[PDB]
Amino acid sequence: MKEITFKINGQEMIVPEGTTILEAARMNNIDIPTLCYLKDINEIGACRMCLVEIAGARALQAACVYPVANGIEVLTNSPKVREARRVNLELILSNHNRECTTCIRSENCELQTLATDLGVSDIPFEGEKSGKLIDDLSTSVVRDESKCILCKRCVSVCRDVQSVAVLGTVGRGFTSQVQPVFNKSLADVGCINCGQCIINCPVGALKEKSDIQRVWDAIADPSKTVIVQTAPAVRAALGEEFGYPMGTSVTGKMAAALRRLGFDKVFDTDFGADVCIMEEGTELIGRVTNGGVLPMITSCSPGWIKFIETYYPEAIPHLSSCKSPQNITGALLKNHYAQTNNIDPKDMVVVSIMPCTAKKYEVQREELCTDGNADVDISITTRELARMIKEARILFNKLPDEDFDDYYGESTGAAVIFGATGGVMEAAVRTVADVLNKKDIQEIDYQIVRGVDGIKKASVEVTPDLTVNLVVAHGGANIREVMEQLKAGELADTHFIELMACPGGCVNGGGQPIVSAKDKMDIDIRTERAKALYDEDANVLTYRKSHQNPSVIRLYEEYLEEPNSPKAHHILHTKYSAKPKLV
Amino acid sequence: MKEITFKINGQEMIVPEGTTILEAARMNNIDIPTLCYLKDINEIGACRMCLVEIAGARALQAACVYPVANGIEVLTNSPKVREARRVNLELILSNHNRECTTCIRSENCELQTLATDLGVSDIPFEGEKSGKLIDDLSTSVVRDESKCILCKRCVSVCRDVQSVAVLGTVGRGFTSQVQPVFNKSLADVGCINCGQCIINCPVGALKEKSDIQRVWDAIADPSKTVIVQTAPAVRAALGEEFGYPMGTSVTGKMAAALRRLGFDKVFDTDFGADVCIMEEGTELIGRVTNGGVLPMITSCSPGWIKFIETYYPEAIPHLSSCKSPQNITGALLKNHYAQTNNIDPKDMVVVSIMPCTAKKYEVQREELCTDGNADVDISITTRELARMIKEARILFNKLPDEDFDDYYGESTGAAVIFGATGGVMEAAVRTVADVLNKKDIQEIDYQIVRGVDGIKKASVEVTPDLTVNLVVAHGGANIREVMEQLKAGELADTHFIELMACPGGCVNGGGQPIVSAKDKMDIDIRTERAKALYDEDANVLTYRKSHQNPSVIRLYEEYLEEPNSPKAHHILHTKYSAKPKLV
Numbered sequence A, B: 001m002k003e004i005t006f007k008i009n010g011q012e013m014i015v016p017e018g019t020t021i022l023e024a025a026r027m028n029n030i031d032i033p034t035l036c037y038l039k040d041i042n043e044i045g046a047c048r049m050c051l052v053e054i055a056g057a058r059a060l061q062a063a064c065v066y067p068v069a070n071g072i073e074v075l076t077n078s079p080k081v082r083e084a085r086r087v088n089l090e091l092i093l094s095n096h097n098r099e100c101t102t103c104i105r106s107e108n109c110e111l112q113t114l115a116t117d118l119g120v121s122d123i124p125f126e127g128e129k130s131g132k133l134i135d136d137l138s139t140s141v142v143r144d145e146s147k148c149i150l151c152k153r154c155v156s157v158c159r160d161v162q163s164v165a166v167l168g169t170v171g172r173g174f175t176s177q178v179q180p181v182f183n184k185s186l187a188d189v190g191c192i193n194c195g196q197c198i199i200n201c202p203v204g205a206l207k208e209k210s211d212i213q214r215v216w217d218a219i220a221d222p223s224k225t226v227i228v229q230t231a232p233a234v235r236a237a238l239g240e241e242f243g244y245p246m247g248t249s250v251t252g253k254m255a256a257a258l259r260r261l262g263f264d265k266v267f268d269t270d271f272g273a274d275v276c277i278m279e280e281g282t283e284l285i286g287r288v289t290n291g292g293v294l295p296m297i298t299s300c301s302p303g304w305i306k307f308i309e310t311y312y313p314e315a316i317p318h319l320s321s322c323k324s325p326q327n328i329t330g331a332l333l334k335n336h337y338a339q340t341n342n343i344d345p346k347d348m349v350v351v352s353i354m355p356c357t358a359k360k361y362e363v364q365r366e367e368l369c370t371d372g373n374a375d376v377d378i379s380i381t382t383r384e385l386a387r388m389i390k391e392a393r394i395l396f397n398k399l400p401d402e403d404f405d406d407y408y409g410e411s412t413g414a415a416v417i418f419g420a421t422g423g424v425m426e427a428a429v430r431t432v433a434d435v436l437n438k439k440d441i442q443e444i445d446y447q448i449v450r451g452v453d454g455i456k457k458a459s460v461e462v463t464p465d466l467t468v469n470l471v472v473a474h475g476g477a478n479i480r481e482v483m484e485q486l487k488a489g490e491l492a493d494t495h496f497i498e499l500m501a502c503p504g505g506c507v508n509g510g511g512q513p514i515v516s517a518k519d520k521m522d523i524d525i526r527t528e529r530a531k532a533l534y535d536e537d538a539n540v541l542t543y544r545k546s547h548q549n550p551s552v553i554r555l556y557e558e559y560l561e562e563p564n565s566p567k568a569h570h571i572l573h574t575k576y577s578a579k580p581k582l583v
């Protein structure tokens, strides 16, 4: 490690080799504007915002990608720098459609914050913006080309982080635009509905498919009763919308606010989640005792199973036949609650507040229906629920707390930890150990693989006669790596591999509220969300295990008999088919 | 008091007579959109944004000015209400220029918040705007009629609370615009530079005169050294810009930030304020001992003295020849500091940070010059200081603290109370009692006059042979009332009256940062600012009395000789002439 000495603006510093002047000034309490810069993701120098005077330099240099050097002098407040920033913002703003009353981003468009910050009132230079081509055809992602700034963040994210890379650049000059391949639509190619591309864009050129009109139409029907259900991870970040500090639980406030909307029933996805935990435990027991297809993987997140269908069909024996916890609880409410309440199943409308955006495509699937009836009707993301609350506009900061409904709102901590990565797998191994060997484990040690961060390996003795190999995976690149190893066959001994496309778990999902870059250089939002969720876990004083909850025991005794029954297979078990690829 | 029962949205409530529905919903934790409503100021129903359904009503009614009645039923989320709100936003935005990148208000324009809140899709209803012209001619206030939406808050403020009313409405249809009288400019009529009209406008149609370009030109000069001057009320509300809670002191942080800006010298006005208090007290003693013109009034705030010379020339003999504390400090730096430092008086540039906007007109006055030299050069408000430091872009939330330079940065609590209501006169009577009778008083009981709030009276025995009558006034209507009473001669026995043009004192001045009506309904920002300033006063552990400060004693002994000297009169005392009126 080499030590570099540099002198800026009255202060000298020693830094390691590879240091950039930007985060060096950040550490030394100086801020420089950023558009195209992301920490360790997009470092190319296309933004052309961050100019600083360099001693001995013919012209200005961009501080974003500028490596430090020894003995240099840097001054950041010359008149040339200010004039260059003003003129360059005037140039770049002549393309972005200036009707900022109606952008979804609106208040936190980083371009708008820069525009106000530089105080550049006038725009002397006119122009002819590029062609307006609204791609309002796909299922989840909507693109608008009248806004895009060629920041290149979206393409870098979809190339590196997700290892999919269905976006590229075409043309030259004004003809240069970001497009999918073959001039098709997003849904016509192998897009995974990752949600990272829509969350990382600093302008609002991308938006999600809005179904709030359908929601208002559904709630407007007196003949239709509404069943709303909640994720464990909605209270992980929603408080950030209302100016609350990171890590606030508003669960009772959320229930009260949803009741003020006039929803007939409020409920949690937790109960069916415990049901499917019992499920995967049951076919674990079966595949152990019958030599089932191994290694086993879950079927929780729609995104990566979509990826497996699209790209690697050869692992289709390895998937779990179970349907998603969303799908489990949706079918459960549409059947058992309907039987108890003696109401026509078409007379219920079920709405879900989930953070994945891939569920928008997942609900559109033909085969996720029971008895020809829709298990769930409308799925919505956290951001658009927030805007629904804002258009209703109840002062959220003074709500009291409320409880959930019988029976399917009850909670357990091992099912609270669904929000973080591997909590599903933790609950599964804890429950199967409790069932088979009466073993009381709370946490599992994880082996961090050298050179790859985000992949986690574990192996704990479930029974003295059977030690189960455990692998955790989040991040599309990690999925690609572990799938390549699985095709190579070196994971033959492995038993469970848990996968989601979105890195860091659902707290880092596509439906989570938008955050800027500044807080990302400060604090990992994943870390604070995980701490808040784990603190919520430690406070669950009713049950830390799913199989001990009296509600799931009641349902199993009365209506579900045992898992892997013919009724259980017919209602909760499904098959998947490979999808045609257009790549 | 009559009790009214009303049943809204599933809950019944009792209110006193005259309690309209909006605050009834507010205390019941329900919010309704407001544009044209202000608490106790503007109740007219022009906005037509706050529509709510009423049982048995042919059409919708505006909740803003709708009185409650017994046995009514109110529904707030019918589809009719939503469609009406959406169409009225679509209509009203068709006139407001949609160039929201470069409004001064920008981020916190209430129209932007409403536009995002209602989630308006597009504006199909095109056309042309009203005729436009920018009156970029007045000294302080700048108008842009292309933006304004006929909220009528500005005209109500300038009519009621200021008792000036130089704004009105003209024309029919599109020709209906708010304008001054006789198609003139703002500076051509009896405008007082109140600043309330600037602070209260919820759209950004009004702004202050910007001189940041002159500031950057001045600081760019190496041949000119810069001395910056701070008012005590600057840190009363600066923190609100950076997301800090109400009542945060960043004084040392401000000193550090200013030093990072390249200012050569920093100084606090408390020294000159103490000198002015001594001069006023010496004039007190002289007019008592020589039968001077009574009652005594200050000459502190430029606004009200502008009002007096413009409207009531008969009060000139009752006025005090002393200049404003910032002006006296500027002259002192122009003469005594120049003598000590042996630097040519034109080679200094002095910039002042005032919460008044009337100082912009005040510095333009030709009579306020010493020896043909400009006492102070540039004055800027707190808001544009925030803008200049934001574009300077140092991360203000992690700055350490710094001290002020000698001998003119030292402070006393008697000068800390300068910004608060009545503190100047408090310090004056405390110091004169200390000088003449060695009387130790910390606070004086005040008589609140019945029927008028903001007019404040006291009479405590300064000496057993002389009790001084004490009156404090803030608010243009209160100024008008006390001036009318003075002309009637009812205040013959009175000795001191304070006149602050902006209501509530300079802590509520035009230079303070913009706040929204949501802030104004629940809490008075004046109250929290006064509490912060008084807590700062209680922590002043160096001196609670001006005349015990060694710095003022040194300057009086070495350079100022005795107060009310011929040199003191020639340097610190001035005459005012009546200005022609065009009303």
Ligand code: SF4
Residues within 6 Å of the ligand: A096, A097, A098, A099, A100, A101, A102, A103, A104, A105, A106, A107, A109, A110, A111, A112, A147, A203, A204, B101
């Ligand atoms: S980039 Fe989009 S959100 Fe930002 S100011 Fe422009 S239109 Fe508004």
Ligand code: SF4
Residues within 6 Å of the ligand: A147, A148, A149, A150, A151, A152, A153, A154, A155, A178, A201, A202, A203, A205, A206
């Ligand atoms: S969406 Fe547009 S602005 Fe955002 S990264 Fe992609 S190309 Fe750049």
Ligand code: SF4
Residues within 6 Å of the ligand: A141, A157, A158, A162, A164, A165, A166, A167, A190, A191, A192, A193, A194, A195, A196, A197, A198
């Ligand atoms: S959804 Fe995923 S695959 Fe599709 S463009 Fe975005 S990041 Fe790429």
Ligand code: SF4
Residues within 6 Å of the ligand: A300, A301, A302, A303, A304, A355, A356, A357, A358, A499, A500, A501, A502, A503, A504, A505, A506, A507, A508, A509, A510
């Ligand atoms: S992290 Fe969450 S949103 Fe992302 S794929 Fe997994 S379950 Fe879906």
Ligand code: SF4
Residues within 6 Å of the ligand: A101, B096, B097, B098, B099, B100, B101, B102, B103, B104, B105, B106, B107, B109, B110, B111, B112, B147, B203, B204
């Ligand atoms: S009213 Fe002014 S500040 Fe508000 S959006 Fe329009 S232009 Fe921008």
Ligand code: SF4
Residues within 6 Å of the ligand: B147, B148, B149, B150, B151, B152, B153, B154, B155, B178, B201, B202, B203, B205, B206
């Ligand atoms: S400044 Fe103009 S737009 Fe604002 S309230 Fe007054 S008249 Fe209406």
Ligand code: SF4
Residues within 6 Å of the ligand: B141, B157, B158, B162, B164, B165, B166, B167, B190, B191, B192, B193, B194, B195, B196, B197, B198
């Ligand atoms: S500065 Fe004062 S007098 Fe002039 S328009 Fe504003 S409120 Fe009225």
Ligand code: SF4
Residues within 6 Å of the ligand: B194, B300, B301, B302, B303, B304, B355, B356, B357, B358, B499, B500, B501, B502, B503, B504, B505, B506, B507, B508, B509, B510, B511
């Ligand atoms: S109250 Fe304050 S801001 Fe208003 S005129 Fe007086 S000193 Fe200036």
Ligand code: FES
Residues within 6 Å of the ligand: A033, A034, A035, A036, A037, A044, A045, A046, A047, A048, A049, A050, A062, A063, A064, A065
């Ligand atoms: S912000 Fe520095 S090059 Fe992008």
Ligand code: FES
Residues within 6 Å of the ligand: B033, B034, B035, B036, B037, B044, B045, B046, B047, B048, B049, B050, B062, B063, B064, B065
């Ligand atoms: S807020 Fe203006 S009419 Fe009600």
